[PDB]
Amino acid sequence: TNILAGAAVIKVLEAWGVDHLYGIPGGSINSIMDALSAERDRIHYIQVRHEEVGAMAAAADAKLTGKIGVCFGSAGPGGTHLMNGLYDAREDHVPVLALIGQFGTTGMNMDTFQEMNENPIYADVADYNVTAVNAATLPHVIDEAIRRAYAHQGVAVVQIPVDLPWQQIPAEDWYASANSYQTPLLPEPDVQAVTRLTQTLLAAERPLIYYGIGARKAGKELEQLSKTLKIPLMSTYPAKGIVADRYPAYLGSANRVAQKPANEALAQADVVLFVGNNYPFAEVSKAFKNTRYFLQIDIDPAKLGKRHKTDIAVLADAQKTLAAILAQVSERESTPWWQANLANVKNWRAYLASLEDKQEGPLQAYQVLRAVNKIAEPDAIYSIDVGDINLNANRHLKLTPSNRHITSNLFATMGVGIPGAIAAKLNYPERQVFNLAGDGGASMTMQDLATQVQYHLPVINVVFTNCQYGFIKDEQEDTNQNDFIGVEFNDIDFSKIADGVHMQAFRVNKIEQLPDVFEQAKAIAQHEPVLIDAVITGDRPLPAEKLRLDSAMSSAADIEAFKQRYEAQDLQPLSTYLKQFGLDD
Amino acid sequence: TNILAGAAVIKVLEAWGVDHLYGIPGGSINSIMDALSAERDRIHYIQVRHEEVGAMAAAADAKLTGKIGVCFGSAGPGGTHLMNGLYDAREDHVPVLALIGQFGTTGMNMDTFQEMNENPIYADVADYNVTAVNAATLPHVIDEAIRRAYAHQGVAVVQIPVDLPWQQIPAEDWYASANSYQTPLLPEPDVQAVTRLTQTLLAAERPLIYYGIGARKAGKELEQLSKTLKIPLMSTYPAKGIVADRYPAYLGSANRVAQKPANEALAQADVVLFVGNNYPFAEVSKAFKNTRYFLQIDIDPAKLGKRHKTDIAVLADAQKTLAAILAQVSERESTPWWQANLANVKNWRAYLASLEDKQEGPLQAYQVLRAVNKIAEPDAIYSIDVGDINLNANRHLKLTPSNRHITSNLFATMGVGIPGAIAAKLNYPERQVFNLAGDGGASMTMQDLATQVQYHLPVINVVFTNCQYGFIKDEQEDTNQNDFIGVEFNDIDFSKIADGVHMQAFRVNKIEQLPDVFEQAKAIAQHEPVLIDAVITGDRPLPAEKLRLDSAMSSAADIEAFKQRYEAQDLQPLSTYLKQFGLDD
Amino acid sequence: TNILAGAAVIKVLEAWGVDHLYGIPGGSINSIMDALSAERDRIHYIQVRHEEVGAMAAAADAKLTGKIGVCFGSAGPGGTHLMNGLYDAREDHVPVLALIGQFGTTGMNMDTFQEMNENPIYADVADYNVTAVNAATLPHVIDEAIRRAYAHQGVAVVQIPVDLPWQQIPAEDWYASANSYQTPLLPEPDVQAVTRLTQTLLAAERPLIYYGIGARKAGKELEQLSKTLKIPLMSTYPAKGIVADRYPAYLGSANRVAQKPANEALAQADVVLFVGNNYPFAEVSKAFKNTRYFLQIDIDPAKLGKRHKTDIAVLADAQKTLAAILAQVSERESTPWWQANLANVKNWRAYLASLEDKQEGPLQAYQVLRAVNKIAEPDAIYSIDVGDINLNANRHLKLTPSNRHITSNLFATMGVGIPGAIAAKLNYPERQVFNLAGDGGASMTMQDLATQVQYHLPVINVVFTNCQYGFIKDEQEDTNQNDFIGVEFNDIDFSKIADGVHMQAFRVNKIEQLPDVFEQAKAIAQHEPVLIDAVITGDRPLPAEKLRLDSAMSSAADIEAFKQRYEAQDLQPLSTYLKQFGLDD
Numbered sequence A, B, C: 001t002n003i004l005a006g007a008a009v010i011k012v013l014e015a016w017g018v019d020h021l022y023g024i025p026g027g028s029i030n031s032i033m034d035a036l037s038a039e040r041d042r043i044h045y046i047q048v049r050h051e052e053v054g055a056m057a058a059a060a061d062a063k064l065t066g067k068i069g070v071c072f073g074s075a076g077p078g079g080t081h082l083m084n085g086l087y088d089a090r091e092d093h094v095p096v097l098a099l100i101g102q103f104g105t106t107g108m109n110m111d112t113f114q115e116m117n118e119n120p121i122y123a124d125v126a127d128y129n130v131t132a133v134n135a136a137t138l139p140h141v142i143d144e145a146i147r148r149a150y151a152h153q154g155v156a157v158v159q160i161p162v163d164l165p166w167q168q169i170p171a172e173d174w175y176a177s178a179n180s181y182q183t184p185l186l187p188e189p190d191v192q193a194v195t196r197l198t199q200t201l202l203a204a205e206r207p208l209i210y211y212g213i214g215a216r217k218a219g220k221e222l223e224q225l226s227k228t229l230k231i232p233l234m235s236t237y238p239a240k241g242i243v244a245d246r247y248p249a250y251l252g253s254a255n256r257v258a259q260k261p262a263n264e265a266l267a268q269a270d271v272v273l274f275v276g277n278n279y280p281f282a283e284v285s286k287a288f289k290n291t292r293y294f295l296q297i298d299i300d301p302a303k304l305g306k307r308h309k310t311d312i313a314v315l316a317d318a319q320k321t322l323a324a325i326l327a328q329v330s331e332r333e334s335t336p337w338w339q340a341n342l343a344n345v346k347n348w349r350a351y352l353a354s355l356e357d358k359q360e361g362p363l364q365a366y367q368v369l370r371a372v373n374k375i376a377e378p379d380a381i382y383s384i385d386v387g388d389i390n391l392n393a394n395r396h397l398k399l400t401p402s403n404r405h406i407t408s409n410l411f412a413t414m415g416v417g418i419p420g421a422i423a424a425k426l427n428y429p430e431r432q433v434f435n436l437a438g439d440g441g442a443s444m445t446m447q448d449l450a451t452q453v454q455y456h457l458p459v460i461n462v463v464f465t466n467c468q469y470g471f472i473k474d475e476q477e478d479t480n481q482n483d484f485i486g487v488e489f490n491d492i493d494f495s496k497i498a499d500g501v502h503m504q505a506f507r508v509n510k511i512e513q514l515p516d517v518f519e520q521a522k523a524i525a526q527h528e529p530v531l532i533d534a535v536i537t538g539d540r541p542l543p544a545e546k547l548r549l550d551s552a553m554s555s556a557a558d559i560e561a562f563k564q565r566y567e568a569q570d571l572q573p574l575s576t577y578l579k580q581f582g583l584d585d
Ligand SMILES: Cc1cc2nc3c(=O)[nH]c(=O)nc-3n(C[C@H](O)[C@H](O)[C@H](O)COP(=O)(O)OP(=O)(O)OC[C@H]3O[C@@H](n4cnc5c(N)ncnc54)[C@H](O)[C@@H]3O)c2cc1C
Pocket: A211, A212, A213, A214, A215, A235, A236, A237, A238, A239, A253, A254, A255, A256, A257, A258, A275, A276, A277, A278, A279, A280, A297, A298, A299, A300, A303, A316, A317, A318, A319, A386, A387, A390, A407, A408, A409, A410, A412, B113
């Protein structure tokens, strides 16, 4: 007969399979809290200590699962605290629903306490942004918000006046269209564009396949096409893991969160196959300036020819198109280009290994990640924060397709380590989860280590304490005339922080302390969360984008200093291998 | 001859007397950081651990001093982290300048890393919101932003492309108009409106003067007019302290962060003089429904007759107008209304005193604030956060006009305790500063306890740990049908948090522990910061807005339960004193 | 007991003294139309043919009277049509209330016909911008909107769901605050600052007083200061008429809608008193590059030191401050500067008169304005459109303090001639009202010549038909390398247009036709609107900003071609006069 509007709303969420949602209560959202209380056995409300962690975790839910992430905040400061999480979702194009509290209709526009016109606040970030003004339509307005967030892969925001969820509406007049939701059966790629793309890729002397997360399902195809046609493989930083890191022709990513082989190969390549990629640096770094042919495959029309003058752009699904190229090619024998790149990758990985393998004295980030690699399970998930850890994790973590790693890819908000590991462990309680965060990123959301304790989420948290905003110090070293300002700061002892939130923790600062501490952490994380605070040296990581190793481009003074500073004595430039296999530079 | 644009900009700030500014560096704001580095002996850059603390502290600067507060943030997530601080400034109408980083002009609109159209993000909160596109005009654009923030008492936002501060501009072509800034000499209030207002106030049988922070300078006038004409005085919560708290006819504030005498008197009053007030609850609580005449004095035309049908509204300065009323009145002898209200205030203060004066057993918020009162210096400044502490601080802190207390008055963002005490101690290094925060408000900005350590700011931090969002639990108790959800949580041991940031701290939970701990804290705070974590009981404070003490309005069962729960056995309703002095109710 | 919400909203408008309002009905604003129908005897609705005319007339009301202009539009297209009128009110800082229709609250957010979230559309232009969601607070929201538009001198926009005006609210609950209304306080001048300003003014060798419409109430003091101290006067184009144009030492306005004496003088001046002026061209034309001392007087702090570094700034009412200067000074004797300037003004006026007094020939703009002046009454109001007509009206109309002229001063929207004239005849039916419009400007709002017929508003409409966008053509001549484009077009016979809307009209093209035609127009306009379509030549008005006259700065060939083109054979540069009185240039 009747039903309360707020109860109907929680049922629309239950209909769309929403398992858990995050927020902090307040008077302006208490009628929705009331509805959640009755249904607490069907949808799990996770109370966070700061709302941006709720919004960031909701984004990570959708990143990991493909399902809509949900968070809420009370009127005014509850809702504006969501901003860094909602912009992350807009930028990383994943579906998120945010509910914002608002004063009742009876007191709106009266200029009463913590009441304002909230609709202008969400206009930029949200794809759908509405203030609900009627309780009977409120279930449809919520269903509308979810349909559009999914369809448009973005943020949908509904500001709800607190009095409407307590109203009665006729129980038969609302529905959730979850039952109509579906995946498209897309057409097969047109055979002539596939053939045209293949010929051009076969005649290339120095070819590359450069893929992004759009090729997430084409792991097998990419790797087989690589070794069948003798084409090196390189990706964007987030596409790391689609092809296993130990694959001998994986060059890594290009630019600063990058690897030496990827950068050098890109400047020599004559034909690039750009697949499901939208690398933001293409134009500003003139990455493709020496490319002769540029071939592209993307599912989205707005991307076609965006990053460079494209010769052939196929609008199609990456995996289908790669499987169709694969189906018309045969083995090619090892070329000079294949051989030179393989030798270069071996030289690089030996460098990274000698850093990782030091066994005594002062702790550096490199060995902390070798110890992370030692205790990692083959399907672990990593929530990585933003800073030097994106660079070091991309070089040292040895991922396979069973792993997941997430960060704030484009907006790049700091603080994402902790919320992402909370979302990961809620979705996958049986998978090992790691949170790799630098000290500045981890202090921005440190209060939510208590949420991991409260909901008993066994996360392995590793904080890299350098008493610096390392990523920025290095930039200041490169651009600034006057001394470093704002990048070195006071120590925070995160094992005391973790103890305050009643979580087990260790602090280490010598390489030799690592093995024991990490074995204890692997065992504690079978049941409880644990934190390791690695006090590391402030060494600058080798800048892949400022290599000074070639005698024809850098003077011997520069090369000696570069080799010295970066312990890069045994690194050879690509040109050494090119000359060796009979190629020029 | 030439000067670099970023150097000229730091000089425009120095010209407007900007002593310190807050932020966190990033690549998109490094050319401004470079300029700050050279001038580090003239403007003090304070690096915070989270940008909302920088924006909130900048707002508190202007709250305390009347001078423009300045903060900055890098592009994307640096700038959106400022939101809770900037909305606080818009709402509390104080001048703040925020500088937002942005990618260089050369890469803007190229869709490159952490680059977006940032101008839509600041459109709602800012009075002035511009992206600077030329380096020669950039000193004028900054000067423009400060002039308007001051003139309009609001937020001015400038998004600066990083490449323009490193450009050369002719040194003679820029200036800062600080030299033209001035206070208006306002006209004296028109003598006939003052006389009309006075007659109506003199004929009132049950009068009240209800003032707000607009009467900040009329402390003497308010108090003398009170005792010369026998008129009780009541204020808004932030106007507490303008007249000393021990003044026998100060009734307190009305509504929930309120006091019993203020609430009861307002329903009996026949003539209200509303002075420099903009109480947000006037309409939604029907506060003035029984008022017969409503007289108002405000400096701002948009306020005149806003909160109620006003009989006489004088547009003038509060202090000038009160001094002019005072100049034409003589002593009146004690009326029944004066006498009844005085007796009622005595009854109330005895209640608050018996709570404060318990000497053993389980710690409650009441005694923690009696201990705060004991060590307080006559001119201490209090940064108060948002939650039950606004209610308890308004009842127990004994302020005088030499004190300052600040919070987020209208927007009411949690987290303001720590940034406000940082701003207070930077401006006034010789004054004792307190930060009174509840546990949920203090965990939102807990990482910046490290900033107090790093810049050596001796703040006394007192955290009230109830393992609850107390203010919200009580609301749920009043409105919600189903059980409490989201308002009780895990303990955080803030003396371990404080130890992690290398600050001295104590944790107490028995009334008898207070005196020693507070004496030690008063002495440590002579040189270092200190934190006390008071573990308190979850007792609900007496709800002044839900009194059940009058036998003619509430049944005896209700009154017994009310008296029992709130240890309010000896509280009498106002009607007892009205009947006693020959007045009806 | 109850009243309808729509009736109370109209009662609030009546209370604030609103006599007339403009708009076009629609389903979404039909409950407001219903209310208006009931009140047709007390408040008068003016139906326009296009909604921007309604917004432009609403703006013109406030410009002419100082009282708030009121306009409305229906949902979607009705409201977006108001845009040019509303930004004109924002830019020329005048109070306007715009009511926007919206679908009822039940249909909102259901994506039904002509229903969209309308609140983001108005966020940039409106000082106050809200959607009403409740019928009982709707009178307060309308009252709030008028208070803020007056106080803030900007636009207030309220979007109203059609159902709410048809609900019954209690009659007892609403009120309008119109009775408490006051204008802002005028600050008083500090005598010490005034003495300093006066000393600097008297020590000047070549002084100028440059005033804007902030000196509206000080024409007497301005002219008196000029005659007593022997200092010439110049104004912004909108300030023309504050001092009578026939005054011998009134130099005119600077830059392009300028008069040659003002431009020449400004370059020689050593001290400028800048009074209630916000000239937008200061910095970009480097106007004050030679001014040794700049003195400013303004009521607004955001303007002090804004346009140039100010040596003495006074924050006070212009009239009060000018009265103070005048009381400290005595008669001075004629200087060379005074005499040089008067001689230059006689030369310039003699030149404009020669263009005006041609008796036979092809018609030019200059003789048509002479014809307007001969039939103009001493207190006529001029609604002027935008284009060359501002340049020509500024040079040829002889205005006194009894006249009024309005245009779109800073937004500068074409189209305003017809709406400004409608509003002026509504407000001042006893005054002669002119509409002086170029053909491009008149074409954009031509349909509302019918509003003048329908409402019997006797306006004299004068269209200047040059078959060009003359103002742009002359800009293309100055900047464009390739041929003229989009500035010359087909003729529209406006007498046939007027005939179509059933108005009396005439078409002229030879100078000798003018006298009889304007005589007849002057007679018809006592009862009916009349239009004259003056077909004029394509002659460029003398560019007062590009004077090729002085032999020592321009070649004899440039000078002769200039004099030939502009019929300026008898003009002398100010240097001739400066030299005659022993001065240098
Ligand atoms: C601190 C920091 C610095 C960074 N530095 C770097 C760096 O130096 N180097 C670097 O590489 N990255 C870096 N990144 C990440 C970077 O900002 C970009 O987000 C990233 O390069 C984008 O990768 P993408 O192209 O794989 O994914 P996206 O930008 O998400 O784009 C995916 C693309 O795939 C297409 N697509 C989707 N599905 C399919 C399908 N099924 N078939 C076909 N096409 C499809 C999409 O349409 C889109 O074009 C950094 C991140 C951080 C946090």
